Design an enzyme around this catalytic site. Structure first.
Site, short mmCIF file in Angstrom:
data_model
loop_
_atom_site.label_atom_id
_atom_site.label_comp_id
_atom_site.label_asym_id
_atom_site.label_seq_id
_atom_site.Cartn_x
_atom_site.Cartn_y
_atom_site.Cartn_z
N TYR B 509 0.78 -1.57 0.32
CA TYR B 509 -0.02 0.05 -0.19
C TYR B 509 0.98 1.51 0.06
O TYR B 509 0.99 1.80 -1.07
CB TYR B 509 -0.66 -0.19 0.86
CG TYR B 509 -2.07 0.77 1.30
CD1 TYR B 509 -3.38 1.09 0.15
CD2 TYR B 509 -2.14 2.19 1.82
CE1 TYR B 509 -3.75 1.78 -0.13
CE2 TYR B 509 -2.68 3.11 1.66
CZ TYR B 509 -4.09 3.57 0.71
OH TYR B 509 -4.41 4.61 0.72
N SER B 592 -5.71 0.70 -4.71
CA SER B 592 -4.95 2.40 -5.20
C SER B 592 -3.97 2.55 -5.15
O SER B 592 -3.21 2.24 -5.96
CB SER B 592 -6.64 3.00 -4.28
OG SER B 592 -6.49 2.75 -2.83
N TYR B 593 -3.43 3.59 -3.57
CA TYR B 593 -2.50 3.55 -3.90
C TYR B 593 -1.15 3.24 -3.61
O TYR B 593 0.07 3.01 -4.32
CB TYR B 593 -1.82 5.08 -2.17
CG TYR B 593 -0.60 5.71 -2.08
CD1 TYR B 593 0.36 5.18 -1.37
CD2 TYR B 593 -0.83 6.30 -2.05
CE1 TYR B 593 1.60 5.88 -2.25
CE2 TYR B 593 0.26 7.33 -2.16
CZ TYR B 593 1.58 7.17 -2.51
OH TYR B 593 2.53 8.00 -2.24
N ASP B 670 -15.37 4.51 -11.51
CA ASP B 670 -14.66 4.66 -10.16
C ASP B 670 -14.57 6.28 -9.56
O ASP B 670 -14.28 7.02 -10.84
CB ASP B 670 -13.48 3.86 -10.40
CG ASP B 670 -12.53 4.15 -8.80
OD1 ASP B 670 -12.36 4.95 -8.03
OD2 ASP B 670 -11.78 3.40 -8.88
N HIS B 702 -14.18 2.03 -6.52
CA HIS B 702 -12.96 2.07 -6.37
C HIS B 702 -12.88 0.13 -5.46
O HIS B 702 -11.98 0.12 -5.46
CB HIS B 702 -12.71 3.07 -5.32
CG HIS B 702 -11.82 3.15 -5.18
ND1 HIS B 702 -10.09 3.07 -6.28
CD2 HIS B 702 -10.48 3.46 -4.44
CE1 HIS B 702 -8.95 3.41 -5.74
NE2 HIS B 702 -9.06 3.53 -4.30
#
Ligand SMILES: COc1cc2c(cc1OC)[C@@H]1C[C@H](N)[C@@H](N3C[C@@H](CF)CC3=O)CN1CC2
Ligand SMILES: COc1cc2c(cc1OC)[C@@H]1C[C@H](N)[C@@H](N3C[C@@H](CF)CC3=O)CN1CC2
Ligand SMILES: CC(=O)N[C@@H]1[C@@H](O)[C@H](O)[C@@H](CO)O[C@H]1O
Ligand SMILES: CC(=O)N[C@@H]1[C@@H](O)[C@H](O)[C@@H](CO)O[C@H]1O
Ligand SMILES: CC(=O)N[C@@H]1[C@@H](O)[C@H](O)[C@@H](CO)O[C@H]1O
Ligand SMILES: *[C@@H]1O[C@H](CO)[C@@H](O)[C@H](O)[C@H]1NC(C)=O
Lengths: 728, 728
Positions: B509, B592-593, B670, B702
């Site tokens: 992450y 995501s990240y 998203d 998402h």
């Protein structure tokens, strides 16, 4: 020992086909570009001069995209700043160049972002469309006359087509037709006011912070269509202080009853226009013949001289009602029409007489009428040797219809079985263009006694190079299915051995009136797959295919996703029972309509296919445009054909996909077959728990044709096929 | 233990963790629903009765989504017709049920499509938001008062948050704050008039002919932000004759200068509110203390009680400035603040006095303040055993700060190292919940002598099941880099053998203030991969990570896509040099990240990783929202930080991806990390001729969380990793 035909050869266009694109400029001369010179050639002798030197427009300051030279050849249009829209539409800027002087016209220029420009057929008049309105220049350096004032972006189209008309009807962006004099300018008006909009994101360069939403008036199956009007303006009577008068020609009563299309616009003489109209149920069309009145200054289309064309078995025409070819006096004409047996042949019509007379007949079809003189009609057919996939020029004596001469058949029968032609004005000469099975051959001929004059391009350079490569071969033949001949082709790996079992890729399109088994020479993906990967690439022309009469073509009527899908399945079982295919390595792929059929085949549960690739497929006919879909399917109402619209989806077959490996590919900016279609396929496969492979192409449309995307997709697909066929 | 932990075990939740979610309703009682019955529990004694029988609403006609009992016990809110908007927001229908009787209230109902509902903290007043306007009911059966008249879809938000405030600031749809009396209703108002819209397609069910365009006001980095206003209304002085009067509390002069945000709202007393504000440049924040003026009816915030929280090394707070915890009298408060050495500890603030007093210190961090009494402050820290991934409850005697008891440390140290807590009102009792390293354990305690009362849920049912499964183990350790400890974790296959070499998957992450190495017990995808496929799954907390001080957390200031990417590469390198890892089979993956870091790592040219997966990655910081991005990146201007914005994109590293196998996945709907982000990644790889794998999820956001999509994505990633690692 020789090198093979690699993926890089195809992708990087190593072996290029040579062309000979000419533009006839009179009865005896043509233009041709050589070392960026525009040259004029004399047809009879072969001698040439330079029309426009390559050193001219070196100091222009822009790349000239195209040129168009006035009929009575005093001027030239310089097309630059080209920006593509849809298949045919685009926008550009235009400069005019005075050929007799040295000069560019600097005054009263054609505006930037012009949508369409045309010279009149004689002289040097100009008609153009800018911001959806028509304009006329009588002289290149004089102010334009504004013909229409109603033009509105995405709403009212004057002298240009909207999305469906462009794509599905006229195959052009233009909706302007000059009279042969150039006196009258005919034009269509389209109204899209209530046509629903298709919306999709365009991402553009990485620097664009917020995606753009593209919005296009696009009628899906059963939605509100655009409406059309037709006008004619007298270009000789224009005033610089008074708005021009456009005389409307109204569609016949039998059309105005409901939704309808304008289908064809053909000038017959200086004062007579032909118009074809078609009902939204594309079963029924009407030819109107409209004469000009010197008295009232109006156009009148006598009800009694209307010609009607309807179909019992299917729709009218191949993709639309065929165009008329008028005799010089404008009283009679020729038109390809489906006969009592369902084969398409040339019919002779006389204007104030009721029926027509068939001029050709037999178990083959006329592809097109190419030229008409007082003594001869020239046409292309697939008659020669009963091969539907061959094309030849023929010639009929009008004094005696049984006196038919093939003009191309025996010119070089081994090399050349697929011709097209380009006649001069008055058809004193013709260029023959051969396309296969050998290398393309371009030749010039004289009409009087059909003498070969000169070879123009023979592709000898290409022939040299290809002798140093292990080229695949092509078999073209037929099989029998329920007592009927259906043709197929196979692209066979070099050194093809009939005892070895080869993996087979089935290359499908199978749309209505399509042909994938023919005699043309191609350098493409299949060439690579057979030459390097030793895969057999077959294509098959089943029911619904064209050029073999209506019984085959119309079998698919009101029933897409049906017989054409079964016949691809059955062809592959057939190919299996031939001794040289490994029946455990049969794949299937297709693009567009081919994608739909591939997907329908893959979700059938046949067991024949190990894997498949669908590129930009239709998934549900209710997602595709109205003009095309409704032609084959009717309307998606419980009154009409809803039940089969709903039974012919890819989505309904999602369970069966667990038995095959599947590659789904789609461009995100597809304006034609919307990304939506694949988005629904994938959603249905997820809901059912079926693993598969996907690939989207950002900002690509239906062709996925940008240089990099094109290389990428063929690279991606090759990996997938090799892994499927356990090829290293 | 023979049977292994399967993918289908993960996907089908074969092994369910039990929970014990209770709702404290007083000092000494809580509600707990069991099956469909709401039970009431006595904390001191343990006895319980059924509060509300599951049968009560058999004839309701709708499935209830949730309930809310009024603080006086007289009424219950029944939530149904639940429709999810974003992470926290949703719409619903509500009925009220009088409990004293046994009847539904039928007059003056809460309307359909209610955006938010809340009972006052005392009694049974309701406040609700409908069509972006606030209403108040004093009594459930009585007509509501309209408070705001300015609400407008996507433009003005009264008492609810817009997209960015919901996601980035409040983590809530609600923007309403009742005073502890229920006298005043405070609320924020947001104005998105000039905020640009993100627009994307939504395809919906197959039946939808034309896709929808969804349009959301969403400020990307450097774009126009929403504006905010704050208002307090007196609920006791409402008239059904006159319009309500809202009193505006304006932001401090030092915020009014440029763009700013409302950070925090915390009532101190019945007549005192605390407000925190933050400049758009989020290294400076101001706390305002506002008092009610009984005589004028106004609210005044004196500068004498304003406090400044600023940061030299980074931003303020972990994700936002921390919330104050006030003493009952409202004259002082406690707050987590970064100290002189950059560790986050509790400061004690007196309201008209300068400075504050740190009551805790050390090379560790307070995670949260959990409860405040006259004698004690309760907080959670990672002090114990110097482990940043452990969490324990502590207690401070306020008369002597140096007197700290750990309340949970020694309770069950081998099984329990990570705690959270829920205190009753006035904190007479607390529920401890431990999450790992062992199975979750729920216990009740009394605050008097910190005596354990009762075990609530011990997951013994799950323990027995897992005894019969080949479960992986978890290693939590650290490595040294420069002179600093960086923590990591490994999920290790069952029957692990350090002489053998294992494939390794790095689970990433690495966003700012993240922790991927902790003592939490999880059953997830990594469990399946270690148990079934014998893959080691490693996570690593490098620079930018949280709970270890600002020197580590702020390392990444103005510099995303640098050290956090570098460190993950080093982590993997270090894991290679460990004897039990196969360095030819190291993969990386993140969401995501984490998808952004995975991609930047794959694009680094390090050679360490064979393959990797990015799910819904950020690709370019200019595409993500203003509030999160600018916190770490500043503004994308040439005078601020444009250069590192431009230098930290995934796209610029495209050439480097020829050295790896890459799978890129994004949901098309998203609204958070837009599909745009991956659309641009794919285009860059295509422009450069790099083959990779892709998968879109139509209509997924998402979370990609719908049960079919969730099952489909993990199945797909399992295949990719298995073939990358040559696992049958
Ligand atoms: C000879 O003139 C024509 C030839 C042809 C056509 C139209 C003509 O003029 C009207 C049509 C137009 C149609 N839009 C196109 N399709 C089918 C769709 C997939 F089902 C996707 C797609 O682009 C198929 N072609 C086939 C060849
Ligand atoms: C403790 O409170 C918070 C915790 C957390 C957050 C905010 C909080 O307070 C507002 C932020 C908000 C942010 N939107 C979220 N991201 C990062 C993006 C990828 F770059 C995509 C995405 O959804 C990451 N989380 C991490 C955890
Ligand atoms: C220039 C023109 O024809 N505009 C028409 C307008 O009169 C009408 O309101 C609309 C109905 O769809 O069609 C369009
Ligand atoms: C939560 C609950 O069950 N409450 C009851 C309470 O009403 C009763 O007075 C007490 C003694 O019998 O036992 C307990
Ligand atoms: C109810 C309200 O506050 N409306 C405002 C409006 O007055 C202003 O013109 C606009 C500026 O962006 O923001 C909004
Ligand atoms: C061909 O040659 C003739 C005779 O010299 C000449 O008049 C004519 O202009 C030439 N045509 C071209 C196109 O050069």
């Amino acid at each position: 020992s020789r090198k093979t035909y690699t993926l890089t050869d195809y992708l990087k266009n190593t072996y290029r086909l040579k062309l000979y694109s000419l533009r006839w400029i009179s009865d005896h001369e043509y233009l041709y570009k050589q070392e960026n010179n525009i040259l004029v050639f004399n047809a009879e002798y072969g001698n040439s001069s330079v029309f426009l030197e390559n050193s001219t427009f070196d100091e222009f300051g822009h790349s000239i995209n195209d040129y168009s030279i006035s009929p009575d050849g005093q001027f030239i249009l310089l097309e630059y700043n080209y920006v593509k829209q849809w298949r045919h539409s685009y926008t550009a800027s235009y400069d005019i160049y005075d050929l007799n002087k040295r000069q560019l016209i600097t005054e009263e220029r054609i505006p930037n972002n012009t949508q369409w420009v045309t010279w009149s057929p004689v002289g040097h008049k100009l008609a153009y469309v800018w911001n959806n309105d028509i304009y006329v220049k009588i002289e290149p350096n004089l102010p334009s006359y504004r013909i229409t004032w109603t033009g509105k972006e995405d709403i009212i189209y004057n002298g240009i087509t909207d999305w469906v008309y462009e794509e599905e009807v006229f195959s052009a962006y233009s909706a302007l037709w000059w009279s042969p004099n150039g006196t009258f300018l005919a034009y269509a008006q389209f109204n899209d006011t209530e046509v629903p909009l298709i919306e999709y994101s365009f991402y553009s360069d990485e620097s664009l912070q917020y995606p753009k939403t593209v919005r296009v008036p696009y009628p899906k199956a059963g939605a509100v269509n655009p409406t059309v009007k037709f006008f004619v303006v007298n270009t000789d009577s224009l005033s610089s202080v008074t708005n021009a008068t456009s005389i409307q020609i109204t569609a016949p009563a039998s059309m105005l009853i409901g939704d309808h299309y304008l289908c064809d616009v053909t000038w017959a003489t200086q004062e007579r226009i032909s118009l074809q109209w078609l009902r939204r149920i594309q079963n029924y069309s009407v030819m109107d013949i409209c004469d000009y009145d010197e008295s009232s200054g109006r156009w009148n289309c006598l009800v009694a001289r209307q010609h009607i064309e309807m179909s019992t078995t299917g729709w009218v025409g191949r993709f639309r009602p065929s165009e008329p070819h008028f005799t010089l006096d404008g009283n009679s004409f020729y038109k390809i029409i489906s006969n009592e047996e369902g084969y398409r042949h040339i019919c002779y019509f006389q204007i104030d007489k009721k029926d027509c007379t068939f001029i050709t007949k037999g178990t083959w079809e006329v592809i097109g009428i190419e030229a008409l003189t007082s003594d001869y009609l020239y046409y292309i057919s697939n008659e020669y040797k009963g091969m539907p996939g061959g094309r030849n020029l023929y010639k009929i004596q009008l004094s005696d219809y049984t006196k038919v001469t093939c003009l191309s058949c025996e010119l070089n029968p081994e090399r050349c079985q697929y011709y097209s032609v380009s006649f001069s004005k008055e058809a004193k000469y013709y260029q023959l263009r051969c396309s296969g099975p050998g290398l393309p051959l371009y030749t010039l001929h004289s009409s009087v006694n059909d003498k070969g004059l000169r070879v123009l391009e023979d592709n000898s350079a290409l022939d040299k190079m290809l002798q140093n490569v292990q080229m695949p071969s092509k078999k073209l033949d037929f099989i029998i299915l329920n007592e009927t001949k259906f043709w197929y082709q196979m692209i066979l790996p070099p050194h093809f051995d009939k005892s070895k079992k080869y993996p087979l890729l089935l290359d499908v399109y199978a749309g209505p009136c399509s042909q994938k088994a023919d005699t043309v020479f191609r350098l493409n993906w299949a060439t690579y797959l057979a030459s390097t990967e030793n895969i057999i690439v077959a294509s098959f022309d089943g029911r619904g295919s064209g050029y073999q009469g209506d019984k085959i073509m119309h079998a698919i009527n009101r029933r897409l996703g049906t017989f054409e899908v079964e016949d691809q399945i059955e062809a592959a079982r057939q190919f299996s029972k031939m001794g040289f295919v490994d029946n455990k390595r049969i794949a299937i792929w297709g693009w567009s309509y081919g994608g739909y059929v591939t997907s329908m085949v893959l979700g059938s549960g046949s067991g024949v296919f190990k894997c498949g690739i669908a590129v930009a497929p239709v998934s549900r006919w209710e997602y595709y445009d109205s003009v095309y879909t409704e032609r084959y399917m009717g309307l998606p109402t419980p009154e009409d054909n809803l039940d089969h619209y709903r039974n012919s989806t890819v989505m309904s077959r999602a369970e069966n996909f667990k038995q095959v490996e599947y590659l789904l590919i789609h461009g995100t900016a597809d304006d034609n077959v919307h990304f939506q279609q694949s988005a629904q396929i994938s959603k249905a496969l997820v809901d059912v728990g079926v693993d598969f492979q996907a690939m989207w192409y950002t900002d690509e449309d239906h062709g996925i044709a940008s240089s990099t995307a094109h290389q990428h997709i063929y690279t991606h697909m090759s990996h997938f096929i090799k892994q499927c066929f356990s090829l290293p």
